Design a protein around this nucleic acid. Structure first.
Ligand SMILES: [Mg+2]
Ligand SMILES: [Mg+2]
Lengths: 333, 158, 640, 49, 422, 27
RNA sequence: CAUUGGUGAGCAGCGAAGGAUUUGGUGGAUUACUAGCUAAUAGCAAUCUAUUUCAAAGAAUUCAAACUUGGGGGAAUGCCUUGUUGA
C-alpha cells in the first residue's frame, strides 16, 4: 500500500497500483484478473487508455504502456517523473505532469508527442480533465489553478483558488462546476463557465486530500481517514454551501448527505464507479467500494459507452473511435 | 407480569443530552428530561438493537412419552457401557499392558522350553536345554529369582 | 531482607495463577487481564502479546479482577486498587478486616463483597469522574435473607440494582436506596457461578451438580434447565456473534457448547486444562466475535475459534467444531533447573517437575517456546523401543549448554531422574536431539558437562565412571574411572587441556584431557555436592557437605579460599561473570553473595521461599533464581 | 428509511437467446455526448477525403 | 491472501449475474432435457410453456403440486429474477424451491417431473444456488440416468466432492462411493437436517427410507474397527432414530428398527439407553408390520446387554407398556415359531417382571419356560425370585406347579437355590 | 477426494456492546 | 571373479494397544513486550454531527523555478531568446 484506483470509462475494469509496485488490472464484477505486475519500483498512478486493452503506469522516472496481458509495449522516455496521468478519450491523448512542472501531451495512436508545455510553477500538485472541453486543469504550490490546451504555450486561464498548495481538483460532467481543495484547510467551488467563485468552506477540520464529483452531481470529500458526501452542493444559490452540521435544524444549511470513517487508514484516492451507484476508495490496506445511492448515471448511452460490450463490439468501437479522432488543436475553452 | 416493583424508578428523573451516547434515546428534539420509567423502557429498545432477541428465550420454555430416547442422549456424554462392571471381555479390542520381563533378574542361556504358573503362590517356572530350573517371583515390577537348580545332563523339555 | 546488590525485576513465564481473568474492550480491540500471584498482566486478545504489568507487588495476593475501559480494579485483602496502564491511580480501603471476595462495577457505583456477607458500595464524587472514589453506603445480607455470596452481577437496563447471587438463591438490591426489591425462590443445589445473558432479564446460574439455569429476574421464574450429570460448572458464557450458543465449563477440565435454539450439543473440548489445577477456571466469549478465551490453574491461557460452516445451506446445523487458535503458557510446577542459553540475556532454558523443558525469552514474552520432544529417526533403521502412549521425559536433574557449534549439531545435554542415560537437545531447532549417551556402568546420570568447543560431552555416573562422547556423532571415545562413589561434577577448561572431577567420596581429581593422564589427586574433608568452574579465571567452587564453599585453583591444585556461614545445605550457587563474586543459596532461606578477593560475605538476603537455583547472566546485568514455590522465575538486576 | 439503488436487470440488457440482437439503450442528454461540433467536423473532413 | 484468491470469491458470489454474452451462454446452456446447442437458442417463454403443461400432469398425479402454480410456475414468474431481488425476498424463494424439491423427490421416475424442474433450473438457477437441496433429494437415484445429468450441470459443494470424479463421466457413481459421502460426519448432520424436514412434512417414501437406511447401516459397518468414531456416530444417528420413531408412517418406524439393531450389535450400550429405546419404540407402535419388526428389535437389543442385571426385570412402566402392545398370547406365538431369533435374556427379564408385578399371569410362566430353553444362569435367577414369591405370596396351584416344573428338570439346581435361600 | 477441511484465517470484527454507564441515575 | 547397477524373495538383529515416505491448512516465533478510534492538553468506545459556526492568524519582483536529455548532422511548421512593426 497505499493503493491508487482508476476505473474504466465504462465501469467494466478496475486498475489498482500499489505504491510499492503491485499493479493489477481486473474485471471486478466477474472476478477475472487480466494482468498483474509486481514491478520492484514505485508506481504513482495508472490509467486505462482507449479501452481496457491498454493501460499506462507512472513508475519511478518513466511512464510505461502495457497490454491487456501485462506485456510492456513502450517505454516513454520523454515523460520524466510523471506523477499524475489522464487520458482524453475522444482525442486519444495521454497527459502527464510531475515534479518537472512540464505538461506533456502524447498521442497514443501515432506515438508522437503532440506538445510539451512549461508550467513554470514548480511541481504540479493536482490535475483533472474537463470532459466538456478537454481543457486540463493544473494546481500548483502557489495556490493557483491554470487551464491548458496543447495549442497554447501559455495557460488559457489562471484562477487563484487557495492560499497554499492545491491538493486536489475535480470537474463535474457538465464542465460547469469545479471543486478545489487546498492545504489551507479550505474548499472552494468554482463556476468555470464564467469564472465566479460560488462557495468557500473556509475552515475544515483537517486538510482535504482528494475531491471528486459524480455523474449525478454528488460532491465527495476525503480528509485523511474520513469520507464525506454532499448533495446539491454544486449550485449557485447560497443555501447550497457545504456545512458539516445544521444549527438547530435550519433547513437552509446543507448537512452532509453521507459519511464514512475508515478507522486507521488514510484515503489515497476517490473514484466513482461510472454507471453504478458506488464510490471507489483507495487506502493503505487496499481497495474498498462504498454504496452511495444516487451517485451514478442510471441511463447510459450504448453507442458512446456500453458496460455490456462484447469483444467484437469492442474492436469495432476501437476503430470507429479512431477514425473520427478529434485533432489536438481543436481543444479550446 | 412483573413479580417485583421498584418505586425509586418512578421518581428518578434523568437528563439525556448530557452524554453523547444517551442522545439517541430522545423521541423528539425538544425533549430533554424524562422520568425513570420511560428511561428504562427506552433503554430496553436500544439494548435489543445491540443484541437481537433470539428465538429460544421467547417462544420456547420447558416449564410412555415418545421423546424418551432423545432425552437420555442429552444427559449422558459417554454412550458406551463401562467395561469395569461387565464380567465378559469385549470381542475385538484387548486392554493389555506390558510389564517388566520376568527373566531380566537372571537371564536364561537357552530357549525357554516350558513355562508354568504355580497354582496358588505367585511363582513362575522356566526350563530349557540349558538344563536349569529357574523359579521367579513375578510381581510385575522387579521379578527377582527365588532359586535355580541345575540338573546335569538332563535337557529340560517340559 | 533488602539486598544492596540485587533488586526484584519481574517474574518470567507466568501467565495465569487460576484467578478468573477479566476482559476489557478499548474500542474495537479486546484485552485480557490475568492474575499472577501478587501482580497482574494485561494481554492483547488479538496476538496475546504482553502489554502492561502492575508497577508494584500488592501486599497480599489478588483475589478478584474486573476491568472497565482503561481502568483495571484489583482486589487484595480488604483493599480495592484502581490501576490505569498498570499504574495505581487510587486505592479504595474498606473499613473492615473482612477480605474482599467479589467485585462489580456498573456505571458510577463500585460494589465489593466481603467474606462476612457484607457488600460495600462506593460512588463517584462527580458525574464525570473517571472512577468511583467516595464511600456511599453499606449493605449486608444476613443468613435469613440468603446464604453466602457467590458473585455480584449487574444486568443491563436495571436502574441502580445489583443482582446479588448467593448459594441459597438470588437477591436484587437497589444500591441507591439500599433496599431489597426482590428475593428469588430457594434453589435446591448449591450455586457456583453466575453469568448475565445477552438476552434481557435472564442470568445464567451454574450449580454444583451439573445444572445451568436461565433464571428470569423480571418474571421470577425458571425458563430453561440444562443437565450435565456428574459435573461441577465453573464458568459460563454466551456467544454474541448472532448464533445462540452457550459455553459451559467444568471443574474436570472439559468445555461444552450448546445450541439453545436447537437444544443440542455442538461439541465438547476435552481436557483443555488439567483437572488437578482446577480445570476450566474461566471461559468467556469475546463480545460479538466467534472466538472464546479459556484459562485454568495450570499456568496457561488458550483461545479457540468457530470456523464458518461448510454447508452452503443450513449452516446452523452443520457446525464446525472449535479449533485451537493461539495460546501462551508456562510451567505447571516450580522449575527445577535454569541456565542461560546465550551470551546475551535473550534466552533462558527451564526444566520443571512437570516433565517439560521450556525456552523462556527475557527480552519478550512472545518468543518463549517449548522444546518439542519428538524423536529423530534412528540411523541404524531399528525400531525405537518405547511405550506407544506418548509420555513426556522424566524431569531434568542436570543440564549443560554450549554455543560454539550452535546450528551444526546438538549442543545441550540433560540428565533425568532415575535414568541410566543422558539425552541431547538442539537449541536452534528447539527439538530433542538424535543422540542418547549411556553411562555404561549400570549407574544413573549425576553430572553432565560439555567442552567449550562443543565437540565432547561428559557424563558422570553414580558408580564413579566418567564417560566422554562426541556430540556430532554420539560415539563413545574415552572413559575415566577414578572415583569409587558417585561423581557430582565435571568441567573442562577453555583450552581443553586440564579436566577436573569431584564426587561424593570427597576427592577431586585433575586429569589432562589431551594425554589422558591423572595430573594429581586431592582429598577434602567432606563429601562434595556440586561444582562450578569459571573458565576465564580457572577457579572452581565446591559445595562441600560441611556447609562450606571451597574455591580451588586448577592450575596449582590448592585450596585458595574457604567460605563459612551457611546454616544448611547449599542448594545451588553461581559465579559472577568477571570471576569476583559467588552467589549461593541454602536451605536456611538465604542468598549470600561472597567476595572472593576478601573471602567474606558482603551481602545477605532472606527469601520467603528457599531458592533452588541461582544463575548470573554472562553479561552480569541480571540474576535469576527459582524457588520451591511459584511457577515462574524471579529476575533480579545487579545494582553493582 | 427508504433506500433505492441503480438496479440493472441483466436479462433486459443481455438477451437470453444467443441469436437475438443485444439491446442498445440511448440517452440524448448533451452532457453524455461532448464535442458535438468538433466530431461532426472530422466526419466532414473524412467524408471529403 | 493473494489478489487472485479474493477475486475467486468474488466470482463465486457473482456466478449467476450474466454480466456479458459469454456468461449468458454458459448459464442458459445448462439443461436437463436439452443439449447445449439447442439450449442456447431457446427462450424463457417456450421453456415455461412446457413446464406449465408438465406441472398440470403432476397435479393430476398429486394435488399438492397445484400450489406452486400460484407461486413458482405463474406467468409473472417469467419476469422474476433472483439477482435483482433483496435478501429477504430470496429466502422466501429458497423456501418455496426447497418445498418443491421435496415433492418432486419421489416422482423423478415420471417423465413430467424432469420438464417441471427445467423451469426452476433455467429461471431460478437452482443448479447454482440451491445446489445442496437438489442433490440431497436425488441422492437415491444415483444409478438413474437423471442423476448423471444433474452432476454434469451442477458445481459440487464442498461436502459432496466425493462425486467430483463422476461429473461428465460415462459410469454412474458406484454404490461404494455413496458410503464414503455418508461416512464424513458433517454430511450426516446435513442429511439429518434434510431427513428431519421430510418427517415434519410427512414427505417420506419407501425408496428414500430404503436408501437412507442402507447408507446408515453401512456407515456403522465401515466404522466397526474404530471405536472412537462409532462413539461420535451415536449422537447423530440415534437422534435420527428418535425422529423416525416419532413418525406415524410405518415404513419410517421400520427403518428405525433396522438402524437401532445394528448399533446394538456394533457397539455395546448402557442399559438406560437401551431401556429408553424401548419406550420410544413402544410409544407409537400401531401398524402390524411395524409391530412384528419391533418385537424382533426388542429381543435383539437385550442380547447385546453384557453387564450385571442383564436379565434384571424391566421397570414397571416399561412392563405395562410392553404388555399393552404385546398381549401374553402374542409373545407365546412368537415363542412358538421354530425359526425364532435368540431371545432368552429378554424372556428372562420379561419372566421376572411378571412375578414382581402381575400375579394372575403366573400360569403363563409355565408355558413360556417350556417353549424356550433358557440359560442356566437365567433359570437360577427365575428360581431365586419365585422362592421369594412363595414366602410372600400365598401358595397357589400354579405357583407350586412352576416349582414342580423345576423339580422335573434340573432338580439339583433347585436345591442349590433353596440352600442359598432358606 | 474426501472433504477438504481447511482452517481459514479469522480476523477480528467490530461489534457493538451495551454500556452500563447509562444505567446509574441520580435524583 | 567383480558390481559402491536395477528389480525382487527371505533371515539374523532392533522392537510397550504398530512402523515408514510425501503433502494441504492454520497458529507462534524470525528486532527489545507502554492498548483502539477521533476534529487529541480531552471525548468516544451505544458515539455526537440540532453549538462545529463566528472571531483571530495567514499573499516574497522568488512576479524564480527540467539540477531529471544516449551519440552525430539538422530542424519546414512548432517552442525558447532577442530585436522590430502597428495598436
Ligand atoms: Mg505441512
Ligand atoms: Mg541533437
Amino acid at each position: 500500500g497505499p493503493y491508487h484506483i482508476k476505473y474504466a470509462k465504462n465501469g467494466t475494469h478496475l486498475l489498482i497500483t500499489g505504491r510499492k509496485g503491485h499493479v493489477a488490472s481486473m474485471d471486478w464484477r466477474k472476478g477475472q484478473l487480466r494482468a498483474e505486475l509486481f514491478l520492484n519500483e514505485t508506481c504513482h498512478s495508472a490509467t486505462y487508455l482507449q479501452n481496457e486493452q491498454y493501460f499506462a503506469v507512472a513508475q519511478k522516472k518513466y511512464t510505461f504502456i502495457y497490454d491487456h496481458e501485462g506485456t510492456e509495449l513502450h517505454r516513454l522516455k520523454q515523460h520524466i517523473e510523471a506523477r499524475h496521468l489522464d487520458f482524453l478519450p475522444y482525442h486519444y491523448l495521454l497527459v502527464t505532469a510531475g515534479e518537472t512542472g512540464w505538461l506533456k501531451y502524447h498521442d497514443v495512436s501515432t506515438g508522437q508527442l503532440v506538445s510539451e508545455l512549461r508550467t513554470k510553477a514548480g511541481p504540479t500538485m493536482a490535475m483533472a480533465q474537463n470532459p466538456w472541453n478537454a481543457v486540463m486543469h493544473l494546481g500548483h504550490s502557489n495556490g493557483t489553478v491554470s487551464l491548458w490546451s496543447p495549442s497554447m504555450p501559455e495557460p488559457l486561464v489562471k484562477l487563484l483558488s487557495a492560499r497554499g498548495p492545491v491538493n486536489s481538483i475535480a470537474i463535474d460532467r457538465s464542465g460547469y462546476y469545479m471543486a478545489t481543495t487546498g492545504a489551507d484547510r479550505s474548499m472552494k467551488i468554482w463556476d468555470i463557465r464564467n469564472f465566479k467563485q460560488l462557495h468557500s468552506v473556509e475552515s475544515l477540520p483537517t486538510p482535504g486530500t482528494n475531491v471528486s464529483i459524480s455523474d449525478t452531481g454528488l460532491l465527495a470529500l476525503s480528509r485523511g481517514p474520513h469520507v464525506t458526501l454532499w448533495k446539491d452542493a454544486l449550485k449557485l444559490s447560497g443555501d447550497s454551501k457545504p456545512c458539516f452540521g445544521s444549527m438547530g435544524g435550519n433547513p437552509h444549511r446543507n448537512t452532509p448527505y453521507m459519511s464514512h470513517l475508515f478507522a486507521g487508514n488514510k484515503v489515497e484516492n476517490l473514484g466513482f464507479v461510472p454507471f453504478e451507484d458506488l464510490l471507489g476508495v483507495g487506502h493503505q490496506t487496499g481497495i474498498t467500494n462504498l454504496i452511495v445511492p444516487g451517485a451514478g448515471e442510471a441511463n447510459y448511452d450504448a453507442l458512446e459507452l456500453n458496460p455490456f460490450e462484447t469483444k467484437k463490439q469492442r474492436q469495432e468501437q476501437e476503430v470507429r473511435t479512431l477514425l473520427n479522432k478529434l485533432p489536438a488543436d481543436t481543444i479550446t475553452l | 407480569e412483573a413479580a417485583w416493583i421498584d418505586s425509586d424508578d418512578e421518581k428518578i428523573k434523568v437528563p439525556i443530552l448530557v452524554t453523547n451516547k444517551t442522545k439517541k434515546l430522545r423521541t423528539s428534539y425538544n425533549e430533554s428530561k424524562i422520568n425513570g420509567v420511560h428511561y428504562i423502557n427506552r433503554l430496553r429498545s436500544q439494548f435489543e438493537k445491540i443484541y437481537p432477541r433470539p428465538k429460544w428465550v421467547d417462544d420456547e420454555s420447558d416449564s410412555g412419552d415418545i421423546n424418551a430416547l432423545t432425552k437420555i442422549l442429552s444427559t449422558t456424554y459417554n454412550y458406551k457401557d463401562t467395561l469395569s462392571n461387565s464380567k465378559l471381555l469385549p470381542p475385538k479390542k484387548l486392554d493389555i499392558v506390558r510389564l517388566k520381563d520376568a527373566n531380566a533378574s537372571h537371564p536364561s542361556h537357552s530357549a525357554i522350553q516350558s513355562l508354568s504358573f504355580h497354582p496358588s503362590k505367585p511363582l513362575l517356572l522356566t526350563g530349557g536345554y540349558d538344563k536349569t530350573l529357574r523359579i521367579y517371583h513375578i510381581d510385575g515390577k522387579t521379578n527377582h529369582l527365588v532359586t535355580s537348580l541345575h540338573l546335569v545332563g538332563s535337557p529340560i523339555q517340559t | 531482607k533488602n539486598s544492596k546488590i540485587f533488586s526484584p525485576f519481574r517474574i518470567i513465564g507466568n501467565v495465569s495463577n487460576g484467578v478468573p481473568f477479566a476482559t476489557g474492550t478499548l474500542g474495537s480491540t479486546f484485552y485480557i487481564v490475568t492474575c499472577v500471584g501478587k501482580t497482574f498482566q494485561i494481554y492483547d486478545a488479538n496476538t496475546l502479546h504482553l502489554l502492561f504489568v502492575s508497577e508494584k507487588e500488592t501486599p497480599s495476593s489478588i483475589v478478584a479482577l474486573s476491568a472497565h475501559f482503561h481502568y483495571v480494579y484489583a482486589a487484595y485483602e480488604n483493599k480495592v486498587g484502581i490501576y490505569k496502564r498498570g499504574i495505581e491511580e487510587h486505592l479504595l480501603e474498606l473499613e473492615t478486616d473482612a477480605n474482599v471476595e467479589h467485585l462489580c462495577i456498573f456505571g458510577d457505583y463500585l460494589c465489593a463483597s466481603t467474606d462476612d456477607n457484607s457488600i460495600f458500595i462506593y460512588k463517584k464524587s462527580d458525574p464525570q469522574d473517571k472512577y468511583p472514589s467516595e464511600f456511599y453506603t453499606k449493605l449486608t445480607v444476613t443468613e435469613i435473607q440468603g446464604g453466602e455470596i457467590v458473585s455480584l452481577q449487574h444486568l443491563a437496563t436495571y436502574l441502580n440494582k445489583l443482582t446479588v447471587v448467593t448459594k441459597s438463591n438470588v437477591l436484587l438490591f437497589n444500591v441507591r436506596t439500599g433496599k431489597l426489591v426482590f428475593t428469588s425462590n430457594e434453589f435446591p443445589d448449591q450455586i457456583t457461578t453466575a453469568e448475565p445473558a445477552p438476552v434481557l432479564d435472564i442470568i445464567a446460574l451454574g450449580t454444583v451438580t451439573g445444572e445451568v439455569i436461565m433464571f428470569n429476574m423480571r418474571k421470577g421464574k425458571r425458563i430453561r434447565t440444562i443437565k450435565i450429570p456428574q459435573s461441577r460448572i465453573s464458568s459460563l458464557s454466551f456467544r454474541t456473534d448472532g448464533s445462540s450458543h452457550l459455553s459451559v465449563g467444568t471443574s474436570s477440565g472439559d468445555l461444552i457448547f450448546y445450541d439453545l435454539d436447537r437444544r443440542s450439543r455442538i461439541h465438547v473440548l476435552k481436557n483443555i486444562h488439567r483437572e488437578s489445577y482446577g480445570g476450566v477456571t474461566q471461559a468467556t466469549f469475546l463480545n460479538g466475535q466467534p472466538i472464546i478465551v479459556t484459562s485454568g490453574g495450570d499456568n496457561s491461557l488458550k483461545e479457540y475459534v468457530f470456523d464458518p460452516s461448510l454447508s452452503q445451506g443450513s449452516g446452523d446445523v452443520v457446525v464446525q467444531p472449535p479449533r485451537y487458535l493461539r495460546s501462551r503458557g508456562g510451567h505447571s510446577q516450580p522449575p527445577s533447573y535454569i541456565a542461560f542459553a546465550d551470551s546475551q540475556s535473550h534466552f533462558m532454558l527451564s526444566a520443571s517437575k512437570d516433565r517439560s523443558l521450556w525456552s523462556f525469552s527475557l527480552r519478550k514474552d512472545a518468543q518463549s517456546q517449548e522444546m518439542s520432544q519428538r524423536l529423530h529417526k534412528k540411523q541404524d533403521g531399528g525400531r525405537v523401543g518405547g511405550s506407544t502412549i506418548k509420555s513426556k521425559f522424566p524431569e531434568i536433574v542436570a543440564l549443560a549448554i554450549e554455543n560454539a557449534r550452535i546450528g551444526e549439531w546438538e549442543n545441550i545435554i540433560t540428565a533425568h531422574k532415575d535414568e541410566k542415560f543422558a539425552r541431547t537437545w538442539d537449541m536452534r531447532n528447539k527439538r530433542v536431539g538424535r543422540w542418547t549417551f549411556d553411562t555404561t556402568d549400570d549407574g544413573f546420570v549425576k553430572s553432565v558437562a560439555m567442552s567449550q568447543c562443543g565437540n565432547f560431552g561428559f557424563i558422570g555416573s553414580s558408580n564413579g565412571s566418567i564417560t566422554i562422547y562426541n556430540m556430532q556423532s554420539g560415539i563413545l571415545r574415552k572413559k575415566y574411572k577414578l572415583h569409587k562413589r558417585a561423581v557430582t561434577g565435571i568441567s573442562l577448561d577453555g583450552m581443553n587441556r586440564k579436566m577436573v572431577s569431584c564426587g561424593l567420596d570427597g576427592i577431586v581429581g585433575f586429569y589432562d584431557f589431551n594425554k589422558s593422564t591423572l595430573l594429581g589427586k586431592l582429598k577434602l574433608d567432606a563429601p562434595i555436592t556440586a561444582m562450578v568452574y569459571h573458565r576465564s579465571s580457572d577457579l572452581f567452587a565446591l559445595a562441600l557437605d560441611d556447609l562450606s564453599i571451597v574455591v580451588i585453583d586448577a592450575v596449582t591444585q590448592r585450596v585458595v579460599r574457604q567460605l563459612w556461614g551457611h546454616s544448611n545445605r547449599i542448594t545451588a550457587f553461581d559465579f559472577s561473570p568477571e570471576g569476583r563474586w559467588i552467589v549461593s543459596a541454602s536451605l536456611d532461606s538465604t542468598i549470600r553473595t561472597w567476595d572472593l578477593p576478601t573471602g567474606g560475605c558482603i551481602d545477605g538476603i532472606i527469601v520467603d521461599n528457599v531458592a533452588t537455583n541461582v544463575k548470573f547472566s554472562p553479561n552480569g546485568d541480571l540474576l535469576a533464581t527459582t524457588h520451591v514455590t511459584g511457577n515462574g522465575i524471579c529476575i533480579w538486576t545487579n545494582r553493582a | 428509511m427508504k433506500i433505492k439503488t441503480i438496479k440493472r436487470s441483466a436479462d433486459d440488457y443481455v438477451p437470453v437467446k444467443s441469436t437475438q440482437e443485444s439491446q442498445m439503450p440511448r440517452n440524448l442528454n448533451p452532457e453524455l455526448h461532448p464535442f458535438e461540433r468538433a466530431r461532426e467536423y472530422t466526419k466532414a473532413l473524412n467524408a471529403t477525403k | 491472501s493473494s489478489l487472485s484468491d479474493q477475486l475467486a470469491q468474488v466470482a463465486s458470489n457473482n456466478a449467476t449475474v450474466a454480466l456479458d454474452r459469454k456468461r449468458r451462454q454458459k448459464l442458459h446452456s445448462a439443461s436437463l432435457i436439452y443439449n447445449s446447442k439447442t439450449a442456447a437458442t431457446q427462450d424463457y417463454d417456450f421453456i415455461f410453456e412446457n413446464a406449465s403443461k408438465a406441472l398440470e400432469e403432476l397435479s393430476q398425479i398429486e394435488p399438492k403440486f397445484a400450489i406452486f402454480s400460484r407461486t413458482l410456475f405463474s406467468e409473472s414468474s417469467i419476469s422474476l429474477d433472483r439477482n435483482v431481488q433483496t435478501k429477504e425476498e430470496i429466502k422466501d424463494l429458497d423456501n418455496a424451491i426447497n418445498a418443491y424439491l421435496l415433492l418432486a423427490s419421489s416422482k423423478w421416475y415420471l417423465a413430467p417431473t424432469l420438464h417441471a424442474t427445467e423451469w426452476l433450473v433455467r429461471r431460478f438457477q437452482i443448479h447454482v444456488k440451491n445446489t445442496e437441496m437438489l442433490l440431497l433429494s436425488t441422492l437415491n437415484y444415483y444409478q438413474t440416468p437423471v442423476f448423471k445429468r444433474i452432476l454434469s450441470i451442477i458445481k459440487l459443494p464442498p461436502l459432496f466432492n466425493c462425486l467430483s470424479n463422476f461429473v461428465r463421466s460415462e459410469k454412474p457413481p458406484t454404490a461404494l462411493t455413496m458410503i464414503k459421502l455418508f461416512n464424513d460426519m458433517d454430511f450426516l448432520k446435513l442429511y439429518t437436517s434434510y431427513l428431519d424436514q421430510c418427517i415434519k412434512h410427512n414427505a417420506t417414501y419407501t425408496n428414500q427410507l430404503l436408501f437412507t437406511t442402507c447408507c446408515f447401516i453401512n456407515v456403522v459397518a465401515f466404522n466397526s474397527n474404530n471405536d472412537e468414531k462409532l462413539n461420535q456416530l451415536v449422537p447423530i444417528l440415534l437422534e435420527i432414530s428418535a425422529k423416525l420413531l416419532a413418525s406415524k408412517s410405518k415404513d419410517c418406524q421400520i427403518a428405525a428398527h433396522t438402524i437401532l439393531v445394528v448399533f446394538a450389535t456394533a457397539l455395546p450400550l448402557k442399559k438406560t439407553i437401551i431401556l429408553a429405546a424401548m419406550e420410544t419404540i413402544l410409544s407409537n407402535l400401531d401398524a402390524k408390520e411395524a409391530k412384528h419388526s419391533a418385537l424382533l428389535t426388542i429381543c435383539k437389543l437385550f442380547q447385546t446387554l453384557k453387564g450385571q442385571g442383564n436379565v434384571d426385570q424391566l421397570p414397571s412402566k416399561i412392563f405395562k407398556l410392553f404388555d399393552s402392545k404385546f398381549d401374553t398370547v402374542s409373545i407365546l406365538t412368537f415363542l412358538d415359531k421354530e425359526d425364532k431369533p435368540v431371545c432368552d435374556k429378554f424372556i428372562t427379564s420379561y419372566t421376572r417382571s411378571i412375578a414382581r408385578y402381575d400375579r394372575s399371569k403366573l400360569n403363563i410362566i409355565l408355558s413360556l419356560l417350556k417353549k424356550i430353553r433358557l440359560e442356566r444362569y437365567e433359570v437360577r435367577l427365575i428360581i431365586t425370585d419365585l422362592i421369594y414369591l412363595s414366602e410372600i405370596l400365598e401358595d397357589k396351584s400354579q405357583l407350586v406347579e412352576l416349582f414342580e416344573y423345576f423339580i422335573s428338570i434340573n432338580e439339583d439346581l433347585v436345591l442349590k437355590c433353596l440352600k442359598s435361600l432358606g | 477426494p474426501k472433504v477438504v477441511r481447511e482452517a481459514k484465517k479469522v480476523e477480528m470484527t467490530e461489534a457493538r456492546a451495551y454500556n452500563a454507564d447509562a444505567d446509574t441515575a441520580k435524583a
